[PDB]
């Protein structure tokens, strides 16, 4: 009976649910040929987390664990635990430990260790999520460092994500390509389903963040279906969904006028009636307001 609501947050008060970044712009790309099936930032409107989605902003694309050993390419083998430090049980009905990255790329960040007064070290590191050595569902991943020696085995280890190492052709950055969580040629399990617009004239609406680069040319971005604050809010409220589609309006908070309308789908994603690709030209101080429960056949005003 608990009523459905969205948090009241402008675009500049939102963060990405797929990488630790603020939301920069709303975005559409109707001509996208990839299947959209990201695993972070997935939450139903009645508050069921899906895929690898968890609540901590610090947990997104983060890893916790211990280095086991040093391994033409310097590389280190790391057991990964759950974010709360408990051992990951591979028989759990999730694709991978919650927070695991959900895209192919060279993720750039910092590995830090505190020995179990203890010695400490931190170095820049890269995790290639497309690598056959990337097996978070098996509790093990590898990272590489520019540093050659100063990583200790058997010591508590943290990966703090910062951005991408590269987006050149051989860096395999593709935000819609899932990692193979159990390693090469294994089938991913327990995935959140893919999403698509159903009603003619509609396209997906994304919350877009630009992601930092260690080097090279590029302006890469990460698009999420809902911001992390919405995941958190929906989870808290656990409001029953009264139809498959909620109508929402992006409104100016000062004036209350509707800038545009969207459909918020029960599985946790937005569609709009827009024939253009690219960033949405709208005020950043706007926010989404729940209007009413509708269905898939509701005709949105064009934006």
């Amino acid at each position, epitope marked *: 009976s608990k009523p459905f609501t969205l948090p009241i947050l402008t675009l500049g008060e939102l963060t990405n649910s797929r990488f630790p970044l603020p939301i920069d712009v709303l975005y559409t790309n109707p001509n*996208e040929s990839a299947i959209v099936q990201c695993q972070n930032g997935r939450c139903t409107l009645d508050g069921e987390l899906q895929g690898t989605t968890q609540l901590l902003p610090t947990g997104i694309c983060a890893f916790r664990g211990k280095v086991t050993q040093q391994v033409h390419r310097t590389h280190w083998n790391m057991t990964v635990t759950n974010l709360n430090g408990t051992p990951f049980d591979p028989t759990e009905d999730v694709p991978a430990p919650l927070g695991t990255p959900d895209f192919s790329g060279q993720i750039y960040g910092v590995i830090s260790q505190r020995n179990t007064l203890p010695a400490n070290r931190a170095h820049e590191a890269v995790i290639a999520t497309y690598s056959p050595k990337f097996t978070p569902k098996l509790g093990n991943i590898q990272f590489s460092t520019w540093e050659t020696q100063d990583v200790s085995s058997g010591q508590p280890t943290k990966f703090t994500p910062v951005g991408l190492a590269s987006v050149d052709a051989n860096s395999h950055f593709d935000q819609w390509t899932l990692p193979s969580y159990s390693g090469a040629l294994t089938l991913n399990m327990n995935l959140a*389903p*893919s999403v*698509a*617009p*159903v009603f003619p004239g509609e*396209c997906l609406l994304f919350f877009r963040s630009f992601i930092p680069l260690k080097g090279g040319y590029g302006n890469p971005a990460i698009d999420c279906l809902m911001p992390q604050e919405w995941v958190q809010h929906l989870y808290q409220e656990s409001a029953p969904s009264l139809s*498959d589609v909620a109508l929402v309006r992006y409104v100016n908070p000062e004036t209350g006028r509707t800038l545009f309308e969207a459909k918020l789908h029960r599985n946790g994603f937005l569609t709009v009636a827009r024939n253009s690709a690219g960033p949405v030209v709208a005020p950043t101080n706007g926010y989404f307001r729940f209007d009413s429960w509708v269905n898939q*056949f509701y005709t949105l005003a064009p934006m």
Partner: nanobody
Amino acid sequence: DVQLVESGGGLVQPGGSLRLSCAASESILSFNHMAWYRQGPGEQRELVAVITREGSTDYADSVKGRFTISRDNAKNMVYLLMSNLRPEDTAVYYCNRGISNPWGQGTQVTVS
């Protein structure tokens, strides 16, 4: 990126019935939705019926109470059972997981 094929259209008298079948090249359980669409001559494609992964359904007002959409997850098939067919139901019918996925050939339904 998914391939689709639909069939079961043909020529029927008013009040008649048809069953449309749709086959997909990937698991329909991985998609949020499956849907049937139709397009009359010189018109844009319109949504007719939609079914969620859980089996929840919704219909256009024009076919409500006459059409049923259903899915077989084990045979990876979606169906549209059409009863009390009317001349205005004449169109080419398509199945898809959504509007952003490439379309199959379609199946012609003619009610005369």
